[PDB]
Design a protein around this nucleic acid. Structure first.
Lengths: 79, 97, 96, 97, 93, 79, 99, 92
DNA sequence: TCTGACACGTGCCTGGAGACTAGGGAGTAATCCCCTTGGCGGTTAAAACGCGGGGGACAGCGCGTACGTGCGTTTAAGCGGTGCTAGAGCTGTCTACGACCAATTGAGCGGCCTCGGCA
DNA sequence: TGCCGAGGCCGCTCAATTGGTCGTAGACAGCTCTAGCACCGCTTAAACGCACGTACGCGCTGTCCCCCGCGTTTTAACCGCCAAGGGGATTACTCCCTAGTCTCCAGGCACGTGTCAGA
């Protein structure tokens, strides 16, 4: 029940930063499914970088390389 | 130094070493590091002048990551070059359809 | 017992700023973002110069290769000013 | 007026740059997704700065997708975003679907 | 409905659908605004074939997304506002 | 004009391959502007490749490199 | 004999070895790297060839044309997202009418 | 002289189904496929050696890159095909 | 029916295999101390819960304009020849330019303080 | 109100400069023949245009429902502080494995000759 920690009032504040005025009741469960899908695609690639280096700790550079791998560059945490 | 020889501030000699050890080609020309260092300093000086105006409108003194986001998304040439990039703690542009 | 030394562009980004506007500052999180910008454009131009040489069966990256990659990567009016700053340096360098 | 309250709230959260999901529950969900890619007694740890990099990139992705969902609701002449707007948006931009 | 007879027809064949001589006159016109008067260019015959295959694979793909946006609004006729919205969600060209 | 040689009967066959049943009268001019913007994006990059090689003829490989440059890879023309 | 019959392969191991040493990838190449990479390229080539030949024997045909390759790539889930940004010349589209 | 993979592709087809043919433009499309996947794997193994500060690309690097580039059950059948080939080469 | 493209055969040459010598990259130990994980209690910001009301989504309606069909006139695309010349692809020379090496010493970094713009 | 974070000093060291030498990659000029460009005349596939009818887009009105707003109660995030210990990060030491180099020769390509799978 860890996907349920992404609460409903916190999904409303994310929709405000996108300019939305009204929300349907069936949106909240759909948003949780899209975050779970996106997180699995990125973490799968970042654990591959960690075990190649023979480490036991995911570092900040592993996440940056996993996001660039899929066309989403991120500035501000190392390069 | 080799930066003073070309009228520049960024380091010419350090860029020369990064080109030789990066597995790009077998040989590096003599003018290649000088040309690429002058392009890097131009792009840095340009993005730094737009983010300073953004701070000097809010009567702020120090540049913060929010000011860098406003300068890039408000400029046509920088927005297309950096169209696949996320700035940390930047935010969005205000817009109500 | 000493540590390894990390190289950045912070020494020089801070000089180009104190040059035109000496009263403005910059924060440690903004300086980290600007290092990722300089390292990203470096790799884009160097990776494109490396293909141009292989497509023509050369083994040297010259100032002629750097200039062609800058026209393919930068958009529009940004690439017209980057070609003028870059050829004025090679002219001034090799006149000494 | 209940309509000017949502306009007040769109203005407020388009000026801020904070992270809007709580931090302790988000870090639990990331350590649970990790247990599915590891075998028995091969658990992994996370640096505190790697969990913060993964949260800045997840909210930048969710805000960008809820804005294309809003554009598809104004095309059908509604102001309420439905579950069928989010589905068509993921299909037009072919990243995951 | 012969509108369905022709969707079945043109989804079964693989040949090009724009005529070939008019298409090459437009590719040679667009080239004249990227070169100087002095040194004009020529085109290989298989380089125009390669550019026409990629042009129609791009237009057919964009007209499929435009059709999906007309059925979201309970219509079967595609319109100019449908093609404009499909290019924002794509963010390219 | 040369853009006028892309005739309305031909545009209408390309939409039959995409699955369209009915077409508004203002679509024919909007499709001609999309093709001209796409051709100028690719030909600009293919003339840059030609002139770096000091040639006077655009070859089949210059078009393939310019298309791969923009995330549209093409098989079957010697790439 | 040939380094391909030692490994039990058909694609050429000694040519893939030279293409790695002359492509500006690293300063040194390990001895087992060209054997591993030749075997993956032959596995992937024989998978397309099987799916495309299966499509050609539905139409009672005896030769593979570009239309048969397009039909085999878009019908396989995994092979479709490996080649998701690729155009096949003279391939066409999948028949599809929306309800 | 121009080098292609045409010689070997045509030998693999006749090992399984020996009465099927292939056309000249189909064979040109399969050449574009083989050295497109070659380029992707060799470019990712090159970044793996630099991130970890090595000077060598070994079979361990080739394996990690195939897992990043290929989708799920395609990648599991390729890791076993290449491992079997190194075990047999090394018994000689 | 027909025949053009696939498939099978020589004939040479360049790129792969075999054997060796040599030097640095990689694998393996061992040590140190940073930082990840887990527990505790306070305090209180914020999520959860329920109720009521009213605005927006959704279905039905009628009209009127604009898209599609047919049918004949009109245009230029496609096919085939022929001729012309620009320039792509190859080859043989020769010299300037970049890798390699070594012996210097100053630029740039880490570890400090000093304290002043943002809260 | 301090006040944590910019911002100037400051020993120390490894990386940038300089000055030679050695061989090869790139620049240059000439030549052979392929293929791109422009023309011509005939034939007919396909674009053009113009009147007609009607199906579809679109605006208007009505009914329910389901989102939003408010206020009370309940949960657990956040914070400061603690102890313990796994593992990241650096350091010596060596020996195995790969680059570099030559001698030899078979795999793979190009020019031909077929004749059978697709209209």
């Amino acid at each position: 029940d860890n996907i349920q920690g992404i609460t409903k009032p916190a999904i409303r504040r994310l929709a405000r930063r996108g300019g939305v005025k009204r929300i349907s009741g069936l949106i909240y469960e759909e948003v949780r499914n899209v975050l779970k899908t996106f997180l699995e695609s990125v973490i799968r690639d970042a654990v591959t970088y960690t075990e190649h280096a023979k480490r036991k700790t995911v570092t900040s550079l592993d996440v940056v390389y996993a996001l660039k791998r899929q066309g989403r560059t991120l500035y501000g945490f190392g390069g | 130094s080799r930066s003073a020889k070309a009228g520049l501030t960024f380091p010419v000699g350090r860029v020369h070493r990064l080109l030789r050890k990066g597995n790009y080609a077998q040989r590096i020309g003599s003018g290649a590091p000088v040309y690429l260092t002058a392009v890097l300093e131009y792009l840095a000086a340009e993005i730094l002048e737009l983010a300073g105006n953004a701070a000097r409108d809010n009567k702020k003194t120090r540049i913060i990551p929010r000011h860098l986001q406003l300068a890039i998304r408000n400029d046509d040439e920088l927005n297309k070059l950096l169209g696949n990039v996320t700035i940390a703690q930047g935010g969005v542009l205000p817009n109500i359809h | 017992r000493t540590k390894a030394r990390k190289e950045t562009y912070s020494s020089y980004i801070y000089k180009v700023l104190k040059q035109t506007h000496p009263d403005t500052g910059i924060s440690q999180k903004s300086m980290s973002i600007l290092n990722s910008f300089v390292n990203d454009i470096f790799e884009r131009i160097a990776t494109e110069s490396s293909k141009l040489a292989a497509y023509n069966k050369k083994s040297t990256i010259s100032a002629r290769e750097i200039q062609t990659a800058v026209r393919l990567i930068l958009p529009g009016e940004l690439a017209k000013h980057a070609v003028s700053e870059g050829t004025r340096a090679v002219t001034k360098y090799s006149s000494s | 007026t209940p309509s000017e309250l949502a306009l007040y709230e769109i203005r407020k959260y388009q000026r801020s740059t904070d992270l809007l999901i709580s931090k302790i529950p988000f870090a639990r969900l990331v350590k649970e997704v990790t247990d599915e890619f590891t075998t028995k007694d091969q658990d992994l740890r996370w640096q505190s700065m790697a969990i913060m990099a993964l949260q800045e990139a997840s909210e930048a992705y969710l805000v960008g997708l809820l804005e294309h969902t809003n554009l598809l609701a104004l095309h059908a002449k509604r102001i309420t975003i439905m579950k069928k707007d989010m589905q068509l948006a993921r299909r037009i931009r072919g990243q995951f679907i």
